Amino acid sequence: PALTKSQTDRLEVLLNPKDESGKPFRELESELLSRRKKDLQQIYAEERENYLGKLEREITRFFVDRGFLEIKSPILIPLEYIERMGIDNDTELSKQIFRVDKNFCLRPMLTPNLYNYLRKLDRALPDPIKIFEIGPCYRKESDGKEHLEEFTMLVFWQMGSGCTRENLESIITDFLNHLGIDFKIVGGDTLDVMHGDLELSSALVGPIPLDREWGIDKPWIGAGFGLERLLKVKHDFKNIKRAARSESYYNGISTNL
Amino acid sequence: PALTKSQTDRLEVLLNPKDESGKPFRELESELLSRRKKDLQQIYAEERENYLGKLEREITRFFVDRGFLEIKSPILIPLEYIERMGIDNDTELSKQIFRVDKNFCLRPMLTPNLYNYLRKLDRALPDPIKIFEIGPCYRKESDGKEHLEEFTMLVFWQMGSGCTRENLESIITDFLNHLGIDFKIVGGDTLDVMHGDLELSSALVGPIPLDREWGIDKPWIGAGFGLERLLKVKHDFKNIKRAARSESYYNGISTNL
Numbered sequence: 001p002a003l004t005k006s007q008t009d010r011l012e013v014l015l016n017p018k019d020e021s022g023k024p025f026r027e028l029e030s031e032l033l034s035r036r037k038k039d040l041q042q043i044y045a046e047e048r049e050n051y052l053g054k055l056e057r058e059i060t061r062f063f064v065d066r067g068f069l070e071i072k073s074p075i076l077i078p079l080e081y082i083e084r085m086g087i088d089n090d091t092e093l094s095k096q097i098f099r100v101d102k103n104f105c106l107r108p109m110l111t112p113n114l115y116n117y118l119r120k121l122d123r124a125l126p127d128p129i130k131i132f133e134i135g136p137c138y139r140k141e142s143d144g145k146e147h148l149e150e151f152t153m154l155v156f157w158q159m160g161s162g163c164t165r166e167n168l169e170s171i172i173t174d175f176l177n178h179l180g181i182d183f184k185i186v187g188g189d190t191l192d193v194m195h196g197d198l199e200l201s202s203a204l205v206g207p208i209p210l211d212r213e214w215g216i217d218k219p220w221i222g223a224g225f226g227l228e229r230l231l232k233v234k235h236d237f238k239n240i241k242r243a244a245r246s247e248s249y250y251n252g253i254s255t256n257l
Numbered sequence: 258p259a260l261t262k263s264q265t266d267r268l269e270v271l272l273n274p275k276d277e278s279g280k281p282f283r284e285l286e287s288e289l290l291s292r293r294k295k296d297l298q299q300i301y302a303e304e305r306e307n308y309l310g311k312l313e314r315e316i317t318r319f320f321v322d323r324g325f326l327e328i329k330s331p332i333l334i335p336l337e338y339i340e341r342m343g344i345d346n347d348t349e350l351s352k353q354i355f356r357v358d359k360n361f362c363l364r365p366m367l368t369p370n371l372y373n374y375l376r377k378l379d380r381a382l383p384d385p386i387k388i389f390e391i392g393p394c395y396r397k398e399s400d401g402k403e404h405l406e407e408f409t410m411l412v413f414w415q416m417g418s419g420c421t422r423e424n425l426e427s428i429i430t431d432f433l434n435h436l437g438i439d440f441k442i443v444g445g446d447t448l449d450v451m452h453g454d455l456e457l458s459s460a461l462v463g464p465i466p467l468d469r470e471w472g473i474d475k476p477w478i479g480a481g482f483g484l485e486r487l488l489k490v491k492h493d494f495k496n497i498k499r500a501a502r503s504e505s506y507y508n509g510i511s512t513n514l
């Protein structure tokens with residue numbers, strides 16, 4: 001008989017992107033279970049690194065080496081930062097916020113913390129100011145295929161001298177060629193970094209009117225990238241859930257074996 | 258005149274642990290501002306690494322090298338995990354949970370996710386199963402000096418063969434000697450790892466009755482460490498806020514300059 005849709009769903013959980021119709025479900029399942037167990041055994045025997053942790057470390061090295069200061073700022077942030085980012089009821093993002101208690105939320109972006117860092121560090125560091133952060137961000141989402149409610153963002157941000165669209169495109173290009181991820185840049189000045197139909201990043205050239213609220217009055221360039229989206233593309237995952245912080249997948253391998 | 262308490266508070270913000278009464282406040286402040294700006298300039302010119310990020314990477318290397326699998330699991334977890342951990346109204350922890358929506362919370366510990374990992378991985382990996390995770394945890398706290406509401410925990414956990422108190426003490430000892438942090442181990446079997454009066458870690462030898470709820474029926478050893486507490490001790494910070502994810506301190510240096 002033909003496989004049921006439920007059975008095909010089960011096999012797809014166990015199917016790996018580079019895996020290469022008369023056998024019963026039971027046999028196809030046993031074969032895939034055996035392969036995935038071996039995949040996990042090989043990781044455990046050899047590298048033992050988590051893809052999301054490893055990518056964070058690789059990205060950190062890239063930016064530290066190119067003169068950007070590594071920031072680790074709060075994940076739980078004041079709700080006032082959302083309003084101050086110009087996120088009112090007119091915008092999509094207002095309905096995407098995870099509130100915590102009466103005064104806090106889970107950050108949906110790194111931007112407000114990093115605005116504060118740029119303003120503070122400008123009192124201490126030589127121009128240009130170059131900073132980056134990688135860490136958890138949270139948004140309520142409808143979509144499942146390219147969106148996670150708990151994801152990981154990289155932002156890099158330069159302020160002062162050399163903040164041109166050309167230099168922004170150069171950093172993006174060097175970065176993605178370093179990772180081995182194909183892309184196209186599609187065009188304050190605003191740029192989208194695409195992999196086919198998937199947005200890997202939004203990038204911007206300042207100044208913009210919002211800067212004044214944060215005490216910023218210098219030119220700047222920066223961009224935000226989703227790490228799970230980078231992993232999805234690099235590893236050819238069909239669904240972004242394979243790249244997420246998860247109890248269901250480890251390095252894109254089902255843990256339900 | 259004598260410095261006011263407010264003025265002394267201000268200078269203490271700018272004071273560094275290894276910094277070595279007739280000058281006015283204005284002069285003491287200028288001197289300390291100059292020193293802290295230089296400290297930040299030196300970081301920016303040279304290493305550019307954040308202490309919390311760097312410590313996470315150092316700890317990751319230590320455990321990966323000693324055969325532990327690196328886990329990155331969800332930070333936003335089901336509220337049901339709290340109840341299933343035996344955290345009812347009789348316990349301190351029940352009142353410390355940050356709830357999110359109706360069904361979720363910010364994890365106050367890594368334990369429930371890692372219990373699920375141990376059960377799942379036991380179907381795939383050879384005995385013993387050795388895993389670890391480092392990442393954000395959240396607890397409502399009264400205390401300010403040794404507690405943060407947003408902190409970072411390491412848990413390592415071995416299950417199966419070799420799960421003895423001796424092997425647990427050995428891992429802890431090798432780990433803290435590797436980091437260069439002084440400690441005493443004070444004594445399921447339960448151990449506390451102390452630095453003077455400060456608890457760096459709680460460690461346990463299983464089995465315990467709770468294991469059954471999570472589908473675990475093997476011996477185990479493990480321990481949980483606060484990264485900000487390790488940093489506080491290593492860098493001789495008077496207050497743990499200097500070691501936190503923060504907008505107010507960077508590598509223990511005031512950003513309010």
Ligand SMILES: Nc1ncnc2c1ncn2[C@@H]1O[C@H](COP(=O)(O)OP(=O)(O)NP(=O)(O)O)[C@@H](O)[C@H]1O
Nearest residue numbers: 139141146147148151199200201202224225226229
């Ligand atoms: N829910 C999510 N899950 C995974 N990655 C995300 C999510 N939201 C944003 N990102 C990533 O973070 C980057 C910068 O965020 P931002 O520019 O605010 O995204 P966005 O405009 O909401 N993109 P999209 O929702 O795909 O139209 C995006 O380009 C994505 O790579």
Ligand SMILES: Nc1ncnc2c1ncn2[C@@H]1O[C@H](COP(=O)(O)OP(=O)(O)NP(=O)(O)O)[C@@H](O)[C@H]1O
Nearest residue numbers: 396398403404405408456457458459481482483486
């Ligand atoms: N609020 C906090 N801030 C910083 N570190 C913490 C916090 N809570 C726990 N830790 C660290 O995480 C480790 C393991 O957590 P756990 O054993 O649950 O702590 P605890 O028993 O609540 N300790 P304490 O609250 O100091 O009595 C502790 O030994 C600390 O190093």
Ligand SMILES: COc1ccc(C[C@H](N)C(=O)O)cc1
Nearest residue numbers: 109111157202204222223224
């Ligand atoms: C500094 O430059 C940027 C920073 C972040 C982003 C992504 C998104 N607009 C956000 O604010 O998260 C885009 C550009």
Ligand SMILES: COc1ccc(C[C@H](N)C(=O)O)cc1
Nearest residue numbers: 366368414459461479480481
């Ligand atoms: C696997 O062994 C341990 C794991 C975690 C801890 C700290 C605390 N009891 C907690 O559950 O977070 C102590 C031991």
Ligand SMILES: [Mg+2]
Nearest residue numbers: 092139141147
């Ligand atoms: Mg979106």
Ligand SMILES: [Mg+2]
Nearest residue numbers: 192199201202
């Ligand atoms: Mg965008």
Ligand SMILES: [Mg+2]
Nearest residue numbers: 349396398404
């Ligand atoms: Mg406590």
Ligand SMILES: [Mg+2]
Nearest residue numbers: 449456458459
């Ligand atoms: Mg304890």
